[PDB]
RNA sequence: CGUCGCUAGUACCGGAACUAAAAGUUCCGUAGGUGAACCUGCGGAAGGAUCAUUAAAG
RNA sequence: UGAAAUUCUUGGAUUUAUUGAAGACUAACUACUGCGAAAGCAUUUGCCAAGGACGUUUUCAUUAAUCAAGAACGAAAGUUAGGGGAUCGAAGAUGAUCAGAUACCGUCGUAGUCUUAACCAUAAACUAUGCCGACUAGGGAUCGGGUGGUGUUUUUUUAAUGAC
């Protein structure tokens, strides 16, 4: 697995939002 | 709900970011959290107050105050909005000198090691540990969930102690793989 | 070696048990826990 | 540790049973501030009922923000300490004990690209109150200044430091403790500093950081009732 | 009609103390720590333990008569980190969740003008 | 973990051991057993102790179906917790994590081997052989030297071991003096520990330290059972007659330390 | 479906009976080292990967 | 502390508040910016002498550059003899020895870490780059001094200075 090393287009609130959904 | 007030003072260097970004700052506070908002130009501080006739969530005032603090510390606005959206997000902060006494260019190189080339190392921490990192000179702030920030801190501390970025990155893929599993 | 022999000879004349003697290993300690004190009280009481 | 499996503690070996609620025997007591301040009410405290209650009360020090006592947000960053001196009918008479600013305010004033100048003086009042004052100022850049920083030469820093020192010693000596506090609240002192130090070098953020009462005179209750009216 | 207390919160790395006292501070109204409210030493510093710690203090304060509190958050300070951790932050929110009116919030972490050497040594610590 | 890949050094180690056919050898951590099989050829009975069961099984597989199989004995588990059976000689590839306890256990064991060939890291080896006045002379060197004599056989390069350790090691021979010198082990170590806090200190400087001076005073009162300043005076004297107080601990030979011990026993003060 | 065992228990005079038993980082100088395949104290070096913000007496 | 136990603790630990004592050290401001031959040097005030640069239509007139011999200083560590001994802490002792990102953690802690009087003279003592002298491009910031302006602010009487 390769981990993205550049700025994530998706913000923390969006990251946690995906975890819920 | 009682009439309560919070004052968050902002440092001078964050004035210009707020002025251009404030158009997206006051709406969520006044509509979703139902707060009464000022920033005092005389004291250069942001003022929030519970409206007794409109405020319904008693925690909106403190939730807003933390959100302003995150932007005050240097986090990007959308990241700061996570504090309003969530209830389990905290800011962990510390100095490089806490890890180890570095001075002169040794201190400078450690800061570079944390950031990495083009900031490459820092974002690897952020994506791997599900957090955001603000590297303000020798002062470091981490935003995220309590477990996540703990996972973020250990990596930057390892970089401070002198671990090469490549080996740290190798640990990140391992924890990132574990994170997806759970 | 001869001078080593005679001095060894004298040492048998002045010999005593070492069970009660406090070991030099304690030199670094400097402070004793409450449990350690109790054995020393127990040991001294056994000695009378 | 809270768990029962935790190894038995030295205190845990013999435990005194909790059979009395302490606050059953505690008695509330009201604090009042000197007449120098607008809002004399500064809350209440609690003490065990006399078997005395007064002895515990005396020497008790209460710290509070100046904004509450003066009813103005301009003093939000200023904090004052009051010590209980006399007790009368649940009203605890207090006197000035010291003053200091909030940590958040102090970290605000310190900024890069400018010189931090500090001066301290140990001095006594006309009422024989030996006290120590701490004053801070910061260099500022002119309106038309284009240089990034506003550093001042060490000669100016010394030249300012004598001016602040000779001022601070002047008012304190030519004033009583009650009068000295009366000067702090409108904070007339710094405005005197700004004018005196104006010609030597432009300064900003001039404040008396802290006040310490090193020694106290022999207690005079008469000097206390008059202060409280 | 508003009796004010002082909520002194001490957020350490391995535990969090929620302490409410009178305005002077001589008189303890209720002292609670994360260790009391959790079965493992792991989560003494956890935000969850702080929230349980905060709520118990709040319920006690209502019984006493205190209706508002001034918050003095602090960290270990000294030669160690100067900023309160998540445990302190979680406790402060919990006080809002309890309903006690918060008068003023200020950080009283000990900051040395000069300090002795740290426990880490030259190579550092906190591996 | 490293493994030795030089056959010549293994053969040399066996030859220096010069095992008589009558004698029985003890091996510790044989591992692959390339050194072991040679030892079986020249040894009547061989006892082997291995920490890992699989190595022992593989060693069983190497001696498998051979006349030497009956002579070879295989044991498992850490040698410390077990009580080793009698053995005339010990030649083994001990881990250095346990070298220092091992060498002393061999000495401490009753009826110890007359000769043993062991491998240690270079720095440890020099410390074993360090002689009075040498830079590497230490407390351990003084203790082991008095009980037994140790001599350096050869130095084994790191490259021979694979994967190469960062530190070189040298094969060394130790022989335990028979009879053991008649001096109490605890008393000797007690003397050595105080005087080797800093070899470059004066022997008097080590004694005048406050903490140990408590210990010596406590020890002296125990001897009386069998005035703290008085004890300080007596120690200050007995050093002066022996003259050792001026001399550096590192320079003083083993014989000198005996003059230290006997003089203290005359005063009635015993280390341990 | 039987005999003798084996495990637990009860009593009896080692002996001899009875009952029960449904699971599946790289170094420099110095000082030391007795669980040293290496560790440790002090000071120094990069011959080691700089992201964000930043005129707020604005 | 990744996890736990040695450790202190109902003679009250931890935590709260009012104080006092001891020994180190000068945070934030703090900047490869400043000073010093280097090593190094950050609180206030006073005393002692020393020094770079600048101004000078003042003075001597080759008195100079480099340097075997020889001399002063020389980080940290280290030695002798006193003092002091808070923090940290080689060595030593001891708890635990379960789990690999958190895999070397914990408690006690000798010498030392501070100072006085002498030795030791070694560092990646680095610009891995001898010293002196001349010449060979543009650009704008900083530090110290000096010159010029009919430039802003202040002196809130002017002004003169100070700051720009
Ligand atoms: Mg400067
Ligand atoms: Mg220079
Ligand atoms: Mg001394
Ligand atoms: Mg250098
Ligand atoms: Mg040139």
Short mmCIF file of N, CA, C and O in Angstrom, two decimals, chain F residues 172-231:
data_model
loop_
_atom_site.label_atom_id
_atom_site.label_comp_id
_atom_site.label_asym_id
_atom_site.label_seq_id
_atom_site.Cartn_x
_atom_site.Cartn_y
_atom_site.Cartn_z
N UNK F 172 39.77 -16.37 23.64
CA UNK F 172 40.62 -16.23 24.82
C UNK F 172 40.57 -17.53 25.61
O UNK F 172 39.58 -18.27 25.58
N UNK F 173 41.66 -17.81 26.33
CA UNK F 173 41.76 -18.98 27.20
C UNK F 173 41.79 -18.51 28.65
O UNK F 173 42.51 -17.56 28.98
N UNK F 174 41.02 -19.18 29.50
CA UNK F 174 41.03 -18.94 30.93
C UNK F 174 41.23 -20.27 31.64
O UNK F 174 40.67 -21.29 31.23
N UNK F 175 42.06 -20.25 32.68
CA UNK F 175 42.29 -21.42 33.53
C UNK F 175 42.08 -21.01 34.98
O UNK F 175 42.61 -20.00 35.43
N UNK F 176 41.27 -21.79 35.69
CA UNK F 176 40.95 -21.48 37.08
C UNK F 176 42.02 -22.07 37.98
O UNK F 176 42.34 -23.26 37.90
N UNK F 177 42.58 -21.24 38.86
CA UNK F 177 43.66 -21.68 39.73
C UNK F 177 43.13 -22.69 40.73
O UNK F 177 42.09 -22.47 41.36
N UNK F 178 43.86 -23.80 40.89
CA UNK F 178 43.50 -24.85 41.82
C UNK F 178 44.66 -25.09 42.77
O UNK F 178 45.76 -25.46 42.32
N UNK F 179 44.49 -24.90 44.09
CA UNK F 179 43.26 -24.50 44.79
C UNK F 179 42.93 -23.04 44.56
O UNK F 179 43.82 -22.25 44.27
N UNK F 180 41.66 -22.69 44.70
CA UNK F 180 41.28 -21.29 44.64
C UNK F 180 41.94 -20.55 45.80
O UNK F 180 42.03 -21.09 46.91
N UNK F 181 42.43 -19.32 45.59
CA UNK F 181 43.01 -18.58 46.71
C UNK F 181 42.00 -18.41 47.83
O UNK F 181 40.81 -18.19 47.59
N UNK F 182 42.48 -18.52 49.07
CA UNK F 182 41.60 -18.51 50.24
C UNK F 182 41.32 -17.05 50.62
O UNK F 182 41.98 -16.45 51.47
N UNK F 183 40.34 -16.48 49.94
CA UNK F 183 39.82 -15.15 50.25
C UNK F 183 38.33 -15.16 49.97
O UNK F 183 37.89 -15.71 48.95
N UNK F 184 37.55 -14.56 50.87
CA UNK F 184 36.10 -14.60 50.72
C UNK F 184 35.67 -13.80 49.50
O UNK F 184 36.13 -12.67 49.29
N UNK F 185 34.79 -14.39 48.69
CA UNK F 185 34.37 -13.74 47.45
C UNK F 185 33.68 -12.41 47.74
O UNK F 185 33.98 -11.40 47.10
N UNK F 186 32.76 -12.40 48.70
CA UNK F 186 32.03 -11.17 49.00
C UNK F 186 32.97 -10.09 49.54
O UNK F 186 32.86 -8.92 49.16
N UNK F 187 33.89 -10.47 50.43
CA UNK F 187 34.82 -9.49 50.98
C UNK F 187 35.69 -8.90 49.89
O UNK F 187 35.90 -7.68 49.84
N UNK F 188 36.22 -9.74 48.99
CA UNK F 188 37.03 -9.23 47.90
C UNK F 188 36.24 -8.27 47.03
O UNK F 188 36.69 -7.15 46.76
N UNK F 189 35.04 -8.67 46.62
CA UNK F 189 34.21 -7.79 45.80
C UNK F 189 33.87 -6.52 46.55
O UNK F 189 33.81 -5.43 45.96
N UNK F 190 33.63 -6.62 47.86
CA UNK F 190 33.38 -5.43 48.65
C UNK F 190 34.54 -4.46 48.60
O UNK F 190 34.35 -3.25 48.45
N UNK F 191 35.76 -4.98 48.73
CA UNK F 191 36.94 -4.13 48.62
C UNK F 191 37.05 -3.53 47.23
O UNK F 191 37.32 -2.33 47.07
N UNK F 192 36.84 -4.35 46.19
CA UNK F 192 37.02 -3.87 44.83
C UNK F 192 36.00 -2.80 44.46
O UNK F 192 36.33 -1.82 43.79
N UNK F 193 34.75 -2.97 44.89
CA UNK F 193 33.71 -2.04 44.46
C UNK F 193 33.96 -0.63 44.98
O UNK F 193 33.81 0.34 44.23
N UNK F 194 34.35 -0.50 46.24
CA UNK F 194 34.60 0.83 46.80
C UNK F 194 35.77 1.49 46.09
O UNK F 194 35.74 2.69 45.80
N UNK F 195 36.82 0.73 45.80
CA UNK F 195 38.06 1.31 45.30
C UNK F 195 38.04 1.54 43.80
O UNK F 195 38.94 2.20 43.27
N UNK F 196 37.02 1.04 43.09
CA UNK F 196 36.93 1.18 41.65
C UNK F 196 35.74 2.03 41.21
O UNK F 196 35.30 1.92 40.06
N UNK F 197 35.20 2.87 42.10
CA UNK F 197 34.19 3.83 41.66
C UNK F 197 34.76 4.71 40.57
O UNK F 197 34.08 5.05 39.59
N UNK F 198 36.03 5.09 40.71
CA UNK F 198 36.78 5.80 39.68
C UNK F 198 38.24 5.38 39.81
O UNK F 198 38.91 5.77 40.78
N UNK F 199 38.72 4.58 38.86
CA UNK F 199 40.07 4.05 38.98
C UNK F 199 41.10 5.17 39.12
O UNK F 199 42.11 5.01 39.81
N UNK F 200 40.84 6.31 38.47
CA UNK F 200 41.82 7.39 38.49
C UNK F 200 41.73 8.21 39.77
O UNK F 200 42.52 9.13 39.97
N UNK F 201 40.77 7.90 40.64
CA UNK F 201 40.75 8.56 41.95
C UNK F 201 41.83 8.00 42.85
O UNK F 201 42.37 6.92 42.62
N UNK F 202 42.15 8.77 43.89
CA UNK F 202 42.91 8.23 45.01
C UNK F 202 42.04 7.24 45.77
O UNK F 202 40.83 7.42 45.90
N UNK F 203 42.67 6.18 46.29
CA UNK F 203 41.91 5.20 47.06
C UNK F 203 41.27 5.87 48.27
O UNK F 203 40.17 5.49 48.69
N UNK F 204 41.94 6.87 48.83
CA UNK F 204 41.35 7.62 49.94
C UNK F 204 40.13 8.40 49.49
O UNK F 204 39.14 8.51 50.23
N UNK F 205 40.16 8.96 48.27
CA UNK F 205 39.02 9.73 47.78
C UNK F 205 37.77 8.87 47.72
O UNK F 205 36.68 9.32 48.08
N UNK F 206 37.90 7.62 47.26
CA UNK F 206 36.76 6.73 47.23
C UNK F 206 36.17 6.51 48.61
O UNK F 206 34.95 6.43 48.77
N UNK F 207 37.03 6.40 49.62
CA UNK F 207 36.55 6.10 50.97
C UNK F 207 35.86 7.30 51.60
O UNK F 207 34.85 7.14 52.30
N UNK F 208 36.38 8.50 51.37
CA UNK F 208 35.85 9.67 52.07
C UNK F 208 34.45 10.06 51.58
O UNK F 208 33.85 10.95 52.18
N UNK F 209 33.94 9.44 50.52
CA UNK F 209 32.59 9.75 50.07
C UNK F 209 31.59 9.44 51.18
O UNK F 209 31.72 8.44 51.89
N UNK F 210 30.59 10.31 51.32
CA UNK F 210 29.70 10.24 52.48
C UNK F 210 28.87 8.96 52.48
O UNK F 210 28.73 8.31 53.52
N UNK F 211 28.32 8.58 51.33
CA UNK F 211 27.37 7.47 51.30
C UNK F 211 28.01 6.17 51.75
O UNK F 211 27.48 5.48 52.63
N UNK F 212 29.16 5.81 51.18
CA UNK F 212 29.80 4.56 51.55
C UNK F 212 30.29 4.63 52.99
O UNK F 212 30.25 3.63 53.72
N UNK F 213 30.76 5.80 53.42
CA UNK F 213 31.23 5.94 54.79
C UNK F 213 30.13 5.58 55.78
O UNK F 213 30.40 5.05 56.86
N UNK F 214 28.87 5.86 55.43
CA UNK F 214 27.78 5.30 56.20
C UNK F 214 27.85 3.78 56.18
O UNK F 214 27.78 3.13 57.23
N UNK F 215 28.04 3.20 55.00
CA UNK F 215 28.01 1.74 54.87
C UNK F 215 29.12 1.11 55.69
O UNK F 215 28.90 0.14 56.42
N UNK F 216 30.34 1.66 55.59
CA UNK F 216 31.45 1.12 56.37
C UNK F 216 31.17 1.24 57.86
O UNK F 216 31.47 0.32 58.63
N UNK F 217 30.61 2.37 58.28
CA UNK F 217 30.28 2.53 59.70
C UNK F 217 29.23 1.51 60.13
O UNK F 217 29.35 0.89 61.19
N UNK F 218 28.19 1.31 59.31
CA UNK F 218 27.20 0.29 59.62
C UNK F 218 27.85 -1.08 59.70
O UNK F 218 27.55 -1.88 60.60
N UNK F 219 28.76 -1.38 58.77
CA UNK F 219 29.43 -2.67 58.78
C UNK F 219 30.27 -2.83 60.05
O UNK F 219 30.26 -3.90 60.67
N UNK F 220 30.98 -1.78 60.45
CA UNK F 220 31.84 -1.87 61.62
C UNK F 220 31.05 -2.16 62.89
O UNK F 220 31.44 -3.02 63.69
N UNK F 221 29.93 -1.46 63.09
CA UNK F 221 29.12 -1.71 64.27
C UNK F 221 28.60 -3.14 64.28
O UNK F 221 28.48 -3.75 65.34
N UNK F 222 28.31 -3.69 63.10
CA UNK F 222 27.90 -5.08 63.03
C UNK F 222 29.01 -6.00 63.52
O UNK F 222 28.75 -6.98 64.23
N UNK F 223 30.26 -5.70 63.16
CA UNK F 223 31.38 -6.50 63.64
C UNK F 223 31.49 -6.41 65.15
O UNK F 223 31.79 -7.41 65.82
N UNK F 224 31.26 -5.23 65.72
CA UNK F 224 31.24 -5.10 67.17
C UNK F 224 30.15 -5.97 67.78
O UNK F 224 30.35 -6.57 68.84
N UNK F 225 28.99 -6.04 67.13
CA UNK F 225 27.92 -6.90 67.62
C UNK F 225 28.34 -8.36 67.60
O UNK F 225 27.99 -9.13 68.50
N UNK F 226 29.07 -8.77 66.56
CA UNK F 226 29.53 -10.14 66.45
C UNK F 226 30.37 -10.54 67.66
O UNK F 226 31.29 -9.82 68.05
N UNK F 227 30.32 7.92 67.27
CA UNK F 227 31.62 7.32 66.99
C UNK F 227 31.84 7.13 65.49
O UNK F 227 32.80 6.49 65.07
N UNK F 228 30.94 7.69 64.68
CA UNK F 228 31.14 7.66 63.24
C UNK F 228 32.43 8.38 62.87
O UNK F 228 33.15 7.95 61.96
N UNK F 229 32.74 9.47 63.57
CA UNK F 229 34.01 10.15 63.36
C UNK F 229 35.19 9.26 63.73
O UNK F 229 36.24 9.29 63.08
N UNK F 230 35.03 8.45 64.79
CA UNK F 230 36.09 7.52 65.16
C UNK F 230 36.39 6.58 64.00
O UNK F 230 37.56 6.33 63.66
N UNK F 231 35.35 6.07 63.35
CA UNK F 231 35.55 5.19 62.20
C UNK F 231 36.26 5.95 61.08
O UNK F 231 37.14 5.40 60.41
#
